[PDB]
Amino acid sequence: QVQLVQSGAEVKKPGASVKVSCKASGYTFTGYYMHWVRQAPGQGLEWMGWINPNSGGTNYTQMFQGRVTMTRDTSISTAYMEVSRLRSDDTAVYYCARDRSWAVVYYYMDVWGKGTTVTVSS
Amino acid sequence: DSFVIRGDEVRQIAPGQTGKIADYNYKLPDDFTGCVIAWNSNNLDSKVG
Amino acid sequence: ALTQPPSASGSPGQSVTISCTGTSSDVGGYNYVSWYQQHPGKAPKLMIYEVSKRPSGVPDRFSGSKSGNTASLTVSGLQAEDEADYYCSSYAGSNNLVFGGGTKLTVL
Numbered sequence: 001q002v003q004l005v006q007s008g009a010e011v012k013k014p015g016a017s018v019k020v021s022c023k024a025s026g027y028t029f030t031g032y033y034m035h036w037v038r039q040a041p042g043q044g045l046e047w048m049g050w051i052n053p054n055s056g057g058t059n060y061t062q063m064f065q066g067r068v069t070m071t072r073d074t075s076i077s078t079a080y081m082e083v084s085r086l087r088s089d090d091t092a093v094y095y096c097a098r099d100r101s102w103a104v105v106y107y108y109m110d111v112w113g114k115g116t117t118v119t120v121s122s
Numbered sequence: 123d124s125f126v127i128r129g130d131e132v133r134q135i136a137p138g139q140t141g142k143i144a145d146y147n148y149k150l151p152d153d154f155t156g157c158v159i160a161w162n163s164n165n166l167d168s169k170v171g
Numbered sequence: 172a173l174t175q176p177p178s179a180s181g182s183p184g185q186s187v188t189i190s191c192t193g194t195s196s197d198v199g200g201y202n203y204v205s206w207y208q209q210h211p212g213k214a215p216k217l218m219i220y221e222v223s224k225r226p227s228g229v230p231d232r233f234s235g236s237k238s239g240n241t242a243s244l245t246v247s248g249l250q251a252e253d254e255a256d257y258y259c260s261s262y263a264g265s266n267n268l269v270f271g272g273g274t275k276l277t278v279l
């Protein structure tokens with residue numbers, strides 16, 4: 001069992017913040033990287049960034065650079081992704097995804113979370 | 123010296139051995155004079171997750 | 172991002188393909204050009220990772236190669252289990268992955 005138990009849906013006002021958690025289980029949490037990838041319900045799939053529990057080094061796309069901050073928590077074996085301003089363009093389900101490789105950032109992911117929805121209100 | 127290593131890696135701490143620990147963490151020279159001492163510490167240095 | 176054709180047809184027991192295009196540091200640029208299969212309402216799972224190889228548990232009926240400055244993931248002998256979106260991917264350089272739009276494998 002390598003399932004990633006991810007938090008439930010959240011509803012946030014426009015412009016406000018939100019943080020989403022993924023609780024890792026089964027596999028060794030320290031080694032394998034954790035990418036963050038978003039899917040708007042209307043279209044496609046877009047990647048944001050990753051944070052590795054082995055080091056804490058974080059990288060992002062240019063689009064989300066500065067606007068979003070990521071962090072780890074090895075005590076409960078979980079990773080947190082914070083979005084500062086829940087803009088209405090960011091209403092999406094947010095998938096956390098484990099990289100398929102041991103200690104390299106190589107960009108392909110095996111196992112994905114069950115789906116944490118996020119909504120921007122009106 | 124003092125360190126904590128994985129259980130199958132205790133054979134690596136010996137002169138002339140090769141591996142990840144023996145080549146990247148702690149290398150004993152081939153002319154080593156001394157004793158290597160180890161014991162299991164699963165019940166005293168580990169926690170669930 | 173990776174420009175991509177929108178759809179592909181088929182029927183159970185046939186052959187079909189889904190392509191992803193781009194060359195400037197795109198899918199034709201590097202070798203880490205993995206694909207994914209996403210059903211609606213559930214998480215996706217990667218069926219073709221780097222260039223041509225398949226993960227453990229993936230059926231061998233899927234195939235993939237760069238075929239130049241592009242990509243192609245095919246399906247042979249499709250069934251009801253193989254209809255989903257299919258997203259290409261790449262490095263695209265300097266720690267900035269980009270995905271494609273996604274073609275929906277539809278069987279008549």
Ligand SMILES: *[C@@H]1O[C@H](CO)[C@@H](O[C@@H]2O[C@H](CO)[C@@H](O)[C@H](O)[C@H]2NC(C)=O)[C@H](O)[C@H]1NC(C)=O
Nearest residue numbers: 049057058059060061062065066264265266267
């Ligand atoms: C993620 O990695 C990329 C790849 O190096 C970083 O992009 C470079 O960052 C340096 C920082 O001084 C800039 O001088 C370069 O111009 C950047 N390169 C490009 C192509 O933009 C990026 O900064 C990293 N991000 C984080 C948060 O570490």
